[PDB]
Amino acid sequence: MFSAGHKIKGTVVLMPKNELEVNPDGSAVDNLNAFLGRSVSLQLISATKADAHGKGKVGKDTFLEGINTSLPTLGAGESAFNIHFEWDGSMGIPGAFYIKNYMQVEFFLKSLTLEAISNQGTIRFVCNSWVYNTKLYKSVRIFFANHTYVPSETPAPLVSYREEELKSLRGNGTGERKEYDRIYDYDVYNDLGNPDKSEKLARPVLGGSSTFPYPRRGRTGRGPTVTDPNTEKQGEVFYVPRDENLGHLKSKDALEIGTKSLSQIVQPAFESAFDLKSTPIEFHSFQDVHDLYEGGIKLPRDVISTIIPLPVIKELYRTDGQHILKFPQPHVVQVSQSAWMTDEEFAREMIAGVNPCVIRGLEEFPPKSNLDPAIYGDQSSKITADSLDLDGYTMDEALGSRRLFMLDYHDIFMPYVRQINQLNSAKTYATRTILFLREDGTLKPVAIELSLPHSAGDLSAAVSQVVLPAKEGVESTIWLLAKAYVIVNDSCYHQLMSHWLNTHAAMEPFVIATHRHLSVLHPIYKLLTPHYRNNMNINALARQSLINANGIIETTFLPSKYSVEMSSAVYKNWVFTDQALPADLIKRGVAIKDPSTPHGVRLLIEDYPYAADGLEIWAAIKTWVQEYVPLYYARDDDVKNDSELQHWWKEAVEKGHGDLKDKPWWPKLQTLEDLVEVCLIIIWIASALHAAVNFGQYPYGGLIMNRPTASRRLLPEKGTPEYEEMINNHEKAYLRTITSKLPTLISLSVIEILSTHASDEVYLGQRDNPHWTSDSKALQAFQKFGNKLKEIEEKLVRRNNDPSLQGNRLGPVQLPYTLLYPSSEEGLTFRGIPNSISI
Q: Which is nearer to Fe ion, 361 or 530 (CB)?
A: 530
Q: Does position 548 bind Fe ion by CB under 5 A?
A: no
Cα separation values, 251 from 255, 712, 746, Å: 8, 38, 22
Residue nearest to Fe ion (CB): 694
Containing 565, the helix (H) or strand (E) segment is: helix 563-571
Find out whether 508 and 537 touch, Cβ atoms under 8 Å: no
Find out whether 528 and 520 touch, Cβ atoms under 8 Å: no
Q: Does position 495 bind Fe ion by CB under 5 A?
A: no
Q: Is 499 one of the annotated binding-site residues?
A: yes
Q: Which is nearer to Fe ion, 653 or 753 (CB)?
A: 753
Q: Which stretch binds Fe ion (CB under 5 A): 26-34, 458-466, 604-612, 692-700?
A: 692-700
Q: Is 504 one of the annotated binding-site residues?
A: yes
Distance CA 415, CA 426 (A): 15
Q: Which is nearer to Fe ion, 498 or 694 (CB)?
A: 694
Q: Is 694 one of the annotated binding-site residues?
A: yes
Q: Is 800 a catalytic residue?
A: no
Q: Which is nearer to Fe ion, 259 or 514 (CB)?
A: 259
**Secondary structure (3-state) at 580:** coil
Q: Which is nearer to Fe ion, 292 or 357 (CB)?
A: 357
Cα separation values, 184 from 165, 205, 236, 658, 770, Å: 12, 21, 20, 16, 27
Q: Which stretch binds Fe ion (CB under 5 A): 686-694, 761-769, 774-782, 801-809?
A: 686-694
Q: Which stretch binds Fe ion (CB under 5 A): 269-277, 331-339, 344-352, 693-701?
A: 693-701
Distance CA 634, CA 521 (A): 18
Q: Given 690, 706, 753, 792, which residue is catalytic?
A: 690
Q: Which is nearer to Fe ion, 568 or 694 (CB)?
A: 694
Q: Is 690 a catalytic residue?
A: yes
Find out whether 70 and 24 touch, Cβ atoms under 8 Å: no
Peptide bond into 330 cis (omega under 30): no
Let me know if 69 is exposed, middle or buried by CB neighbors in 10 A (0-12, 13-18, 19+): exposed
Q: Given 101, 489, 694, 835, which residue is catalytic?
A: 694
For 517, half-sphere exposure in the C-beta direction (CA atoms, 13 angstrom radius) is 22
Q: Which stretch binds Fe ion (CB under 5 A): 393-401, 520-528, 657-665, 694-702?
A: 694-702
Residue-wise over 818-834: b if at least 16 C-beta within 10 A, else e? bbbbbebeeebbbbbbb
Q: Is 517 a catalytic residue?
A: no
Q: What's the min distance (Å) between Cβ of 630 and Fe ion?
A: 33
Find out whether 63 and 37 touch, Cβ atoms under 8 Å: yes
Tell me how crowded residue 469 is: count the other CB atoms within 10 A of its CB: 17
Q: Which stretch binds Fe ion (CB under 5 A): 62-70, 167-175, 211-219, 687-695?
A: 687-695
Q: What's the min distance (Å) between Cβ of 440 and Fe ion?
A: 34
DSSP letters, 629-644, are: GGGT--SHHHHHT-HH
Q: Which is nearer to Fe ion, 299 or 819 (CB)?
A: 819
In the chain, the amino acid numbered 781 is A
Largest CA distance in the chain: 103
Binding mask 425-444 for Fe ion (x = CB under 5 A): --------------------
Q: Which is nearer to Fe ion, 694 or 744 (CB)?
A: 694
Distance CA 404, CA 577 (A): 26
Q: Is 331 a catalytic residue?
A: no
Binding mask 328-357 for Fe ion (x = CB under 5 A): ------------------------------
Q: Given 499, 517, 599, 757, which residue is catalytic?
A: 499
Q: Does position 694 bind Fe ion by CB under 5 A?
A: yes
As a dihedral over the C-alpha atoms of residue 176, residue 182, residue 188, residue 191, rounded to 10 degrees, the angle is 50
Q: Given 504, 517, 657, 757, which residue is catalytic?
A: 504
Residue in 674, 665, 415 with CA at minimum distance from that of residue 562: 415
**Secondary structure (3-state) at 531:** helix
Q: Which stretch binds Fe ion (CB under 5 A): 318-326, 544-552, 690-698, 738-746?
A: 690-698
Q: What's the min distance (Å) between Cβ of 754 and Fe ion?
A: 6
In the region spanning residues 245 to 284, those forming contacts with Fe ion, defined by CB under 5 A, are none
Give 804's contacts (C-beta < 8 A, 6+ positions apart).
none
Q: What's the min distance (Å) between Cβ of 837 and Fe ion?
A: 6
In the chain, the amino acid numbered 788 is K
Q: What's the min distance (Å) between Cβ of 354 and Fe ion?
A: 12
Distance CA 404, CA 367 (A): 11
Q: Which is nearer to Fe ion, 694 or 818 (CB)?
A: 694
Q: Is 704 one of the annotated binding-site residues?
A: no
Cα separation values, 290 from 296, 328, 335, 563, Å: 9, 11, 13, 29
Q: Which stretch binds Fe ion (CB under 5 A): 111-119, 548-556, 688-696, 812-820?
A: 688-696
Distance CA 285, CA 292 (A): 12
Find out whether 110 and 13 touch, Cβ atoms under 8 Å: yes
Q: What's the min distance (Å) between Cβ of 747 and Fe ion?
A: 15
Find out whether 59 and 86 touch, Cβ atoms under 8 Å: yes
Q: What is the distance, to the nearest Å, from the Cα of residue 124 to the centroid of all Cα atoms in its chain?
A: 32
Instruction: Compute how many residues bind Fe ion; rule: CB under 5 A.
Output: 1
Q: Is 504 a catalytic residue?
A: yes
First to last CA, the chain: 54
Tallying the residues shown for the chain, one arrives at 839
Q: Which is nearer to Fe ion, 256 or 565 (CB)?
A: 256
Tell me how crowded residue 595 is: count the other CB atoms within 10 A of its CB: 7
Distance CA 170, CA 241 (A): 11
Residues tagged active-site:
499, 504, 690, 694, 839
Sequence ranges of the binding site for Fe cation: 499, 504, 690, 694, 839
Sequence ranges of the binding site: 499, 504, 690, 694, 839
Chain residues that interact with Fe ion, rule: CB under 5 A: 694
